[PDB]
Amino acid sequence: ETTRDDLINGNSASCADVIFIYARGSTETGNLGTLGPSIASNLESAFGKDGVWIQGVGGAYRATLGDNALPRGTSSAAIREMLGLFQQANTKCPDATLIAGGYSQGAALAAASIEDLDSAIRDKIAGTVLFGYTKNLQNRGRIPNYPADRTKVFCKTGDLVCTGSLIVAAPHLAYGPDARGPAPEFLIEKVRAVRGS
């Protein structure tokens, strides 16, 4: 369940209508980690298996804990990897609506990548969900260059990374319920807002 490469494996002749790109947290397995599979299952229920492609950020993104301390909250190599996936999606399936998400270091990675993205592609991301957003305070709860209405941040009371620290406390590991309900609910709503039904 933890590794999904639907975009990379996908047939360009039969593109999905929705493409979800997700970055896992530090030290998590596969390319989806602990929260990604839950979101994926709910998206599949809403759009159907052939209706949505789930793509985790693997490759150069090693999800190394120490990289949380770098300027952008992740490595340059990781940002290049996620940018490349958005670019692959845009090229392979130009008519698909994109959605994105990230947890912890992955949330910083998603924010950094989206900020650097060519605006024509960035504008195709109908909604983005961030859990335990490590740059929440620094970025004032926003993703630079991306609208607030398309952004949903899940930052628990007591999760120190949302408050400008890099300390990992218990609330940082409590996003399970959010990934099973409100997060996919938000993504589905944002996709339907622009695609209709």
Method for structure elucidation: X-ray
Q: What is the C-alpha separation between 22 and 173, in angstroms, rounded?
A: 17
Q: Report the domain count for the chain.
A: 1
**CA dihedral over 54, 42, 35, 76, signed as positive or negative:** positive
Give the list of residues 6+ apart from residue 57 with CB closer than 8 angstroms, or none.
21, 22, 23, 24, 31, 78, 81, 82, 85, 106, 109
Q: What CATH number should be reported for the domain holding residue 38?
A: 3.40.50.1820
Give the list of residues 6+ apart from residue 125 with CB closer than 8 angstroms, or none.
86, 98, 99, 100, 114, 146, 150
Length of the chain: 197
Domain that holds residue 44: 1-197
Please, are residues 34 and 112 in contact by the beta-carbon 8 Å criterion?
no
- Catalytic residue set: 104, 159, 172
